[PDB]
Amino acid sequence: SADSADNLSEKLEREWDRELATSKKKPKLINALRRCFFWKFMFYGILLYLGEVTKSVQPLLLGRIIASYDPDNSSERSIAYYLGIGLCLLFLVRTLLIHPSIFGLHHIGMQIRIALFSLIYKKTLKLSSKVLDKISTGQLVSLLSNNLNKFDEGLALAHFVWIAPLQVALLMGLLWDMLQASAFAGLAFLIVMAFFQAWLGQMMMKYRDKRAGKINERLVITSEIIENIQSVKAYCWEDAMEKMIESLRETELKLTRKAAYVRYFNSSAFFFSGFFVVFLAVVPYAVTKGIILRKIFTTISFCIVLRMTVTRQFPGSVQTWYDSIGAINKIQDFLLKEEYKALEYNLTTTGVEVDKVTAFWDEHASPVLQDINFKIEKGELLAVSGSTGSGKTSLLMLIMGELEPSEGKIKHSGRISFSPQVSWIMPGTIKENIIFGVSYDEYRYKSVIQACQLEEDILKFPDKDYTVLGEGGIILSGGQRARISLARAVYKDADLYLMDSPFGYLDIFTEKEIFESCVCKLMANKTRILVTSKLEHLKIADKILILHEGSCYFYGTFSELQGQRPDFSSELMGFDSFDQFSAERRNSIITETLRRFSFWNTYFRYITIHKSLIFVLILCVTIFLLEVAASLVLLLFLYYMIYIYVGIADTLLAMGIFRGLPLVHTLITVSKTLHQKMVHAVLYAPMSTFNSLKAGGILNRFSKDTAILDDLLPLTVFDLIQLILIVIGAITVVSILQPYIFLASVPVIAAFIVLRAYFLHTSQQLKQLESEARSPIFTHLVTSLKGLWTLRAFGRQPYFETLFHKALNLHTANWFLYLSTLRWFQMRIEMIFVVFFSAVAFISIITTGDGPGRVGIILTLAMNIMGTLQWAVNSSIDVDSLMRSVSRIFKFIDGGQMTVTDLTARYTEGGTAVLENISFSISSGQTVGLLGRTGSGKSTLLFAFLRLLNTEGDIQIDGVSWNTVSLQQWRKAFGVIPQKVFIFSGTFRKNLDPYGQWNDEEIWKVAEEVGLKSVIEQFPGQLDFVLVDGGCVLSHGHKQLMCLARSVLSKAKILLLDEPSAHLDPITSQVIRKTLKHAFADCTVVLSESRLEAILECQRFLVIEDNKMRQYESIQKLLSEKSSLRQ
């Protein structure tokens, strides 16, 4: 196998294609994979087997070593000495064999994951356009992310399904004194515990899935709040929002608490089983014959090995193996989906023809285009219009071959250049997008960018042609993005050009210039098809096509339309000034014209009250499980003293469990408190200070830190308690029996501490790389999916495959490094442990072990100490991560005449002053407003009034200086409607009144007053209607009216309007102006405008530039100076 994506793909594709081609009904992905996998997998598998079997040998060697100190036979020092050497070698050898093999398995898992990803990517780019709208988008994201961190770890246990029965059979077969079947007592106990654990694990999954659903809801409201803190503060909404968070948090905790108990009992159950396999193991020796230390010590070590292989190594592989298979099956179902069918290029014609085409998207379709017919000569212009939905753009999909005809033929000449309705951002170099995938030629480039009028904006870009367009399109306005899409489509040399919604939401002036510049001259003699709403274009076009309800309304000469459907023409012409109508209005006019011219309970309470009932219930479970094991013991079918001793053991264990329950209670309480305090601290935060994170780390830390406290503190703590108790016992006993062991062990622990610290520093830093390399694989994917229509249209598939592979290679390189440092670390750790082991074995062997039982116990304690120690290493790693998270959390918590005198503002106490020494007066009830350049800090006056900025000077409102008024009332006076309006998701009643202070009747009265009564009536449920996704169903004008309704209910006196005109068409802007003037007849209205025509209705003006201002008492004084200063 290969170490790179290109090679891994070739191999997978060859086997997959060969089997898929060998069409034995249902070819399978799993077979293509086993043919790659098997010849490496099996070798690491056998090596691990050979490694693990060592554990089944080591106890035998100790039994003989122990025997050498017996009074029997002779004190053969030399034998004890050499056998001791052999034992320490067994530790060393398995260490040296096992770790390399585990590493190799992870290497394999990685290689397979990469091959699978490249296969999927290649497939998504070849999918049929029909199934494209049936496959949920969330499924492709999860198809790749769901097993991202699972598949490659899972192979580590895969060969255990195979190993487990070999070691179980051996350990069973090695039992000494086998017929007195202590074997069944042992196995019956372990078997019952294993099923118990499986059941409990299933309950854990139930809780995880339900909780996950609630988490997503909490996170959505959380990000909504975080990105709009200024509106929450401006509204003085505050704690109502805090309460919304509280109810979501409370819901999650109820589920979490139950999940926590599942985890608690799982861990104590594990402990319980440890005790009993050892305890049951000595029941034979108490029962008749008596004790032989030689055999007892041997017996216990074997019992320990069975516990672990039986309860943990086996079922882990079973669960892993099964889930992995299910993941593969899902991938296969995805791969086996209908393809995009390639278009066959030919030299049949020069024009475009359509012969009786009838077609539809899917089965059960009524949107069948009927009897479509064309004959277009080379170089002719076709203009198409029609009702929205009557195949306005679906026709283009037929032309390009995305949609097949059910009947008829489509003939075309050569290659097609296509520009879609919705621009594809293509993050990257702007010149490169214009000429993407083609050679640069300045002759053509200049001609196209000049003709398309790009120079007007692109020459203002800081790196010109090399200005990079980043994510979000922060460089370009929607009309500019459209302009680039045209330039790209034009730059490409094609025989046929298809222009989807070419008007581009552009100003009519440029729209005309582009049509003549491009449609007529730049595109001269090309065959063209334009989608259009302008009658002038139809007049210009050689052929006119109008569609309605899936069929042709009219096809022919412009004058033929007028001669054959004159009433249609006359009605449209009544709106003679069509160039003055936006596309939306042009669309409504044709839609209407065209359709018009149609042509238990008592005790439950006591159980909560009496903790003594809780104790009994704990004991009852313990009794039950032992009795079940007895049922299996009774297999022998085909005493009072034993009964007493086992009863005693159960009682003691039950009390031990009962004692620790308050810890679970405490853990849930603590994370609840921390979540609540962080939220409070963020809401009542200073402004400017939060700009250190700018919502990035705020959302990410808020979300992630809470999640880790809840899943790990309640888990890692219990493992630590058990591990701690074990080591205390182990050290205490050897220290007493032989003080030289202590002397020897002190430097051993020191060695581990130092290595650990070094390791964690570096590995914690490397971990950052997974996220850095991982994020872009998804950004790449999404971009490719949105661009699918053009990726095929222009033949760019291999370009993108190349980019995808480079991203994968980056990711795997970092992933691999992380894995490698971890493995090295673990190997070093194990070798240190191996060395102290050898030394300890010899301390015992060497000293005067004349009371041999003491020799035996030191040796078995040391031999079996390694299991616990491996857990301890990993637990220490988790602890350090938890403490780092705790610190990150802790870091956050441990006047009618408005009179403004000498006002100054900054974005921080350092920084820059955005406004200095401004003085300004507003007469009571006076309509006033502001003029200034875009980016002159207009919003910083509004924020200075809202007290969101570092500020100086004296503002007198409601008769007093701001200096004597707290933020809530100071802000209360100001009813502000920002350009970016915040919409709270949820029921309209709450969106408008989050406190429940207004009555429904009152709410309706205001809805009527502000013109939203018809809007709320239209939405089902009215006040009970739930508004979603930021008001995705509302006009932004409506959002402004909602804000208005809030302002009037709130009884604000100062009304602040942030350029409503920035987005609202005058046809409605005047309606809201009338509405608010009546609503605010007794109030003072302050407007920030972009144009003189709007500012014109004001009596006093504030004109701001360069952190200074000129006050005018009349528009004429403003105009006289503005003319002199019109620059």
Ligand SMILES: Nc1ncnc2c1ncn2[C@@H]1O[C@H](COP(=O)(O)OP(=O)(O)OP(=O)(O)O)[C@@H](O)[C@H]1O
């Ligand atoms: N691949 C598809 N499968 C099924 N239905 C589709 C598919 N693509 C679009 N549609 C729908 O069927 C019709 C397709 O026609 P077309 O896309 O030409 O309409 P349009 O008038 O261009 O759409 P609009 O102007 O509303 O964006 C639309 O009314 C749309 O709702």
Ligand SMILES: Nc1ncnc2c1ncn2[C@@H]1O[C@H](COP(=O)(O)OP(=O)(O)OP(=O)(O)O)[C@@H](O)[C@H]1O
């Ligand atoms: N709190 C802030 N910290 C840092 N920079 C800011 C802050 N507030 C605004 N800015 C920036 O400084 C200027 C502030 O002016 P303002 O926010 O009034 O601009 P605008 O003309 O309203 O811009 P837009 O049209 O994008 O809304 C802008 O050009 C913006 O880029």
